[PDB]
């Protein structure tokens, strides 16, 4: 036991009966969207950097039917939900807004219909259904918010490209659910394609796929399954503190800022100031690194750059927290283990590890052995993003 | 005026509509596959080099139903499709394979029916229409393959990825219909972003999606309505030429020939050979440079780079026609026109012009004038790959 990952057909069937259960007819429409992780090039996204993530085959799906009635009616079947898991609400008109209120978890849902582009969309029912765990920092809000966008244009075509559907569920992700994240987790949710991982370059939105498909390879995902109180909190504080940095520097983002520059100009600003910078920087410059590396099939190179982020996200951005540091350490005493770091936003949530695929058992074992708390565990591969399912 | 581009909604409506006709009920299955333009990497795909493709709006619609008796039952609404446009015959078996036959068309199908590789396969009835000219270079033969296998998945899923899905579809064309192409048609068609090109590495199938997101840069398509099919071409000569010099130098193929080797390696090929290996190694030199100037916005570099192709593809490869040369010199006479050049195989088919959006009425006027035939025209945007529409 890693837990299991159940595939589509297994979640489709579970929304299905539940939609007939609570509607009392089987749905018209179906899609999916999957969580994330990120193999490395964090807090890069909101800089203009690099990121380069992979789609898990943990997904939320939605099935649903059009209304008559321009209502909104939807079901959640996540416990992780905040009460009540039911909601109903009129589509927005030009007169009143769709507006930002409890439960929270509908607030990702109204985001993405508040901005979705086309018209005139609708009313609708829909049950969600996800094995994205809520809040574990494997990016659900991205996968809800895309399943969302994906199934609102099987009601009404949109005209747009990936990236205007990515901007749209970015923004809701702003206005509804207060938290101004870049746009690594929606890019990925729509273009992961399997057996590859996804640089993407969050100033031009160019996008390469990497292949990461070796039966030598596994990638080890770690739920430390903890969550402190500096996520709602140090998050915005750190897109600021790079903001000024780049100000005083006479950059339009830290994507301006060559590592030596850097270096030659610590006197331009704070202490604190000039360690966010170096972690942003390097992390780019790793990134571009590791993408080479994956390609050529260097694990080590590629492990040895996915530790030197997790030591700038400890001492430079300081977002890493005591348990994920146990979690990366525990990790790297194991043999096999190319390489091990905190993924996502960070104080709390998962690491990600590359290893040989021989080594997993053993490395679960010991890992869970040498952390305090109760830790969960997924053998995840690259999985394709947003899907339309016919019915 | 550019010949308008029907939508997906008429396609669909004009295959249902044919499918009723034809079979005596609606068709439960829908897909669409794209035709393609190249931007620039031309007779570099077989020789494991680099393309710039991106998805047309030009597209196959392919509707139909499972059967019940083991047999498939096509037609096509395509003039141009060799007589008879409708045709039953049983599914391959593990006694007996579908063999290449009459007519022609069919071909394609039954490839990618042999070649599919997940089971068991029911019968089907199927209507294909498109908005692909036939024989024009845009791919008509990659959307029809791609568009079926896309059609075969919906009847029973497959389950390996996009590239192997491509490799099929190439694998029906080099054992059907005899024409052994490279794997760029197939692999756009699949692999398309609207608003986007495709950087194809053909040696390790790693892709770049180009963001094409600047509403002052068109794409104009010429039909020279001369018509190519490649089969009967000099298409497999070219490809065996290039196959004998890289087995001359001994090199893997001529990705891994420099110029300047080749150069030097004048006296272990012919007269001929060189000049055939002379444009692909300088046209994969020419992709890698066009790519770098797109992705920094000199469009008059990758304007200079195709005129470089077309002299190429002309004078070296010896793939161009009178026609293809005067609609290259007429489009390159016209302000506002960066570039020029033949696209796809070859003999006939269509240029590709890139050039300033407020200039394509004056081109358009200007090429026709200067033009000894009848040109069709097609203002292009990039577009979607192969898609399921659930009916
Ligand atoms: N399937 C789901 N059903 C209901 N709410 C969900 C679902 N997926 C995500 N959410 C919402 O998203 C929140 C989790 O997002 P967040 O705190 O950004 O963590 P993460 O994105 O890493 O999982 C939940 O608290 C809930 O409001
Ligand atoms: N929709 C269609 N219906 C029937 N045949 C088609 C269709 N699309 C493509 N074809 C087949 O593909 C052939 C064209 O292939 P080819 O000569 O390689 O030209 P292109 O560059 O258009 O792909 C036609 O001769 C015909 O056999
Ligand atoms: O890599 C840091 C990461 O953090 C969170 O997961 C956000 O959702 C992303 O947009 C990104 O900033
Ligand atoms: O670039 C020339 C081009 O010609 C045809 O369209 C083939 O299908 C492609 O594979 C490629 O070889
Ligand atoms: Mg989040
Ligand atoms: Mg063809
Ligand atoms: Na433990
Ligand atoms: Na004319």
Same mark, same amino acid.
């Given at each position: 036991?890693?837990?299991?990952?159940?595939?589509?057909?297994?979640?489709?069937?579970?929304?299905?009966?539940?939609?007939?259960?609570?509607? &009392?007819?089987?749905?018209?429409?179906?899609?999916?969207?999957?969580?994330?992780?990120?193999?490395?090039?964090?807090?890069?996204?909101?800089?203009?950097?690099?990121?380069?993530?992979?789609?898990?085959?943990?997904? #939320?799906?939605?099935?649903?039917?059009?209304?008559?009635?321009?209502?909104?009616?939807?079901?959640?079947?996540?416990? &992780?939900?905040?009460?009540?898991?039911?909601?109903?609400?009129?589509?927005?008109?030009?007169?009143?807004?769709?507006?930002?209120?409890?439960?929270?978890?509908?607030?990702? %849902?109204?985001?993405?219909?508040?901005?979705?582009?086309?018209?005139?969309?609708?009313?609708?029912?829909?049950?969600?259904?996800?094995?994205?765990?809520?809040?574990?920092?494997?990016?659900?809000?991205?996968?809800?918010?895309?399943? #969302?966008? #994906?199934?609102?244009?099987?009601?009404?075509?949109?005209?747009?490209?990936?990236?205007?559907?990515?901007?749209?569920?970015?923004?809701?992700?702003?206005?509804?659910?207060?938290?101004?994240?870049?746009?690594?987790?929606?890019?990925?949710?729509?273009?992961?394609?399997?057996?590859?991982?996804?640089?993407?370059?969050?100033?031009?939105?160019?996008?390469?796929?990497?292949?990461?498909?070796?039966?030598?390879?596994? %990638?080890?995902?770690?739920?430390?399954?903890?969550?402190?109180?500096?996520?709602?909190?140090?998050?915005?504080?750190?897109?600021?503190?790079?903001?000024?940095?780049?100000?005083?520097?006479?950059?339009?983002?830290?994507?301006?800022?060559?590592?030596?520059?850097?270096?030659?100009?610590?006197?331009?600003?704070?202490?604190?100031?000039?360690?966010?910078?170096?972690?942003?920087?390097?992390?780019?410059?790793?990134?571009?690194?590791?993408?080479?590396?994956?390609?050529?099939?260097?694990?080590?190179?590629?492990?040895?750059?996915?530790?030197?982020?997790?030591?700038?996200?400890?001492?430079?951005?300081?977002?890493?927290?005591?348990?994920?540091?146990?979690?990366?350490?525990?990790?790297?005493?194991?043999?096999?283990?190319?390489?091990?770091?905190?993924?996502?936003?960070?104080?709390?949530?998962?690491?990600? #590890?590359?290893?040989?695929?021989?080594?997993?058992?053993?490395?679960?074992?010991?890992?869970?052995?040498?952390?305090?708390?109760?830790?969960?565990?997924?053998?995840?591969?690259?999985?394709?993003?947003?899907?339309?399912?016919?019915?």
């Amino acid at each position: 036991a890693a837990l299991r990952q159940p595939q589509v057909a297994e979640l489709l069937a579970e929304a299905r009966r539940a939609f007939r259960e609570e509607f &009392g007819a089987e749905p018209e429409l179906a899609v999916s969207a999957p969580g994330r992780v990120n193999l490395i090039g964090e807090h890069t996204d909101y800089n203009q950097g690099l990121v380069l993530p992979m789609a898990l085959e943990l997904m #939320t799906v939605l099935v649903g039917s059009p209304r008559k009635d321009g209502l909104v009616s939807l079901l959640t079947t996540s416990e &992780g939900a905040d009460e009540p898991q039911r909601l109903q609400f009129p589509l927005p008109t030009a007169q009143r807004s769709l507006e930002p209120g409890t439960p929270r978890w509908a607030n990702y %849902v109204k985001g993405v219909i508040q901005y979705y582009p086309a018209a005139p969309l609708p009313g609708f029912s829909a049950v969600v259904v996800s094995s994205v765990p809520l809040g574990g920092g494997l990016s659900s809000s991205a996968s809800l918010e895309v399943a #969302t966008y #994906t199934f609102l244009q099987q009601l009404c075509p949109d005209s747009g490209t990936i990236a205007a559907r990515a901007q749209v569920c970015q923004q809701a992700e702003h206005s509804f659910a207060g938290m101004p994240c870049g746009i690594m987790d929606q890019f990925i949710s729509l273009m992961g394609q399997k057996g590859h991982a996804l640089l993407i370059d969050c100033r031009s939105l160019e996008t390469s796929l990497v292949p990461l498909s070796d039966p030598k390879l596994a %990638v080890l995902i770690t739920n430390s399954n903890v969550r402190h109180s500096l996520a709602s909190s140090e998050y915005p504080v750190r897109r600021r503190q790079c903001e000024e940095v780049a100000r005083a520097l006479g950059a339009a983002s830290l994507r301006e800022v060559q590592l030596e520059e850097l270096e030659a100009a610590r006197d331009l600003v704070s202490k604190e100031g000039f360690r966010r910078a170096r972690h942003v920087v390097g992390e780019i410059r790793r990134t571009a690194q590791a993408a080479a590396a994956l390609r050529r099939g260097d694990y080590r190179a590629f492990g040895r750059l996915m530790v030197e982020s997790h030591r700038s996200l400890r001492d430079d951005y300081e977002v890493s927290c005591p348990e994920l540091d146990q979690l990366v350490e525990a990790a790297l005493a194991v043999p096999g283990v190319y390489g091990s770091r905190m993924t996502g936003g960070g104080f709390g949530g998962c690491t990600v #590890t590359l290893l040989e695929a021989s080594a997993a058992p053993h490395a679960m074992r010991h890992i869970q052995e040498h952390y305090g708390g109760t830790a969960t565990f997924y053998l995840s591969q690259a999985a394709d993003g947003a899907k339309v399912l016919c019915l």
